[PDB]
């Protein structure tokens, strides 16, 4: 799928907290989660407290990918809302992350290629001496 872009949509109503972004977002990266809600409603924040999600588009900036995914799974489970999130860099570069293919990763989908798949059982890994003085690991073979 062609990934969606990042508009200037509003943000949930929140009074502020000490659990938000720090200087790491200034110099390394931060994350942006966007969703759509049918009504204004209470939702617990992954950084502490409760915020009000507006009806229509919603955009929220967070410090970690894990926070974005936790909030997303909570939205999907409790409010039945589909979500997306992106990685934003200090130079304004935006990288689309999830859902990567347009389909959630727990559902099989064509066009995906396996990465890190070993065509053997876990008990067939070679002993360390066979990879000694080489830079390779036993599970990388």
């Amino acid at each position: 799928t062609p990934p969606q872009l990042d508009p200037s949509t509003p943000s949930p109503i929140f009074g502020g907290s000490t659990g938000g972004l720090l200087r790491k977002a200034q110099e390394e990266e931060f994350y942006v989660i966007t969703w759509e809600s049918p009504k204004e409603q209470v939702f617990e924040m992954p950084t502490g407290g409760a915020a009000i999600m507006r009806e229509g588009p919603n955009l929220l900036k967070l410090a970690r990918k894990e926070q974005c995914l936790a909030l997303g799974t909570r939205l999907r489970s409790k409010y039945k809302i589909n979500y997306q999130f992106y990685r934003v860099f200090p130079n304004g570069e935006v990288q689309y992350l999830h859902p990567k293919d347009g389909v959630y990763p727990e559902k099989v989908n064509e066009g995906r290629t396996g990465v890190g798949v070993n065509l053997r059982s876990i008990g067939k890994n070679v002993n360390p001496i066979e990879v000694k003085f080489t830079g390779k690991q036993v599970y990388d073979l």
Binding site: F14, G15, G16, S17, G20, L21, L22, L60, K61
Partner: protein
């Protein structure tokens, strides 16, 4: 109604809050007028002021609580200890400056005010600026220690605690 505590700069997703301790006009003015936050002036003069304050304040504890406090030579010994502490602090400042800043790199200070207005970043966060700051700190601290000694044990002013 009327709430006092607000999100920092109106942004609820920055990890801070606006409280009377942090955002009252009196404390804001006081912090803005300290030498550590005077962005548009030579860091050497700011370091001079900082050292003059700190070396002056350091004299008392060494002179009064030291091992030789009951000796007739207590004032000079305590002043020497305060000067040694100032020397150690200057060494630490030089170490931090060398480790943190490269000569060619620009400043790491923010370039925006709270209102979003562009400003010149503080030259104190550069190698040359920090070097000037620590040199001024050393010169001010030694002078402050000497001034405290001169006021306490050369003129012998009737200070209650000496």
């Amino acid at each position: 109604t009327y709430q006092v505590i607000q999100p920092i700069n109106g942004d609820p997703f920055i990890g801070s809050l606006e409280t009377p301790i942090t955002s009252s006009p009196l404390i804001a003015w006081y912090l803005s007028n300290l030498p550590g936050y005077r962005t548009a002036v030579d860091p050497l003069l700011r370091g001079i002021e900082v050292g003059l304050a700190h070396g002056y304040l350091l004299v008392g504890p060494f002179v009064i609580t030291g091992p030789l406090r009951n000796a007739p030579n207590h004032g000079a010994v305590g002043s020497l200890g305060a000067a040694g502490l100032i020397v150690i602090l200057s060494i630490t400042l030089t170490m931090y400056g060398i480790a943190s800043f490269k000569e060619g790199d620009p400043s790491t200070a923010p370039s925006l005010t709270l209102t979003g207005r562009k400003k010149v970043p503080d030259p104190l966060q550069t190698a040359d600026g920090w070097a000037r700051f620590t040199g001024g700190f050393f010169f001010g601290g030694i002078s402050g220690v000497i001034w405290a000694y001169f006021l306490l044990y050369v003129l012998d002013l009737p200070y209650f605690v000496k």
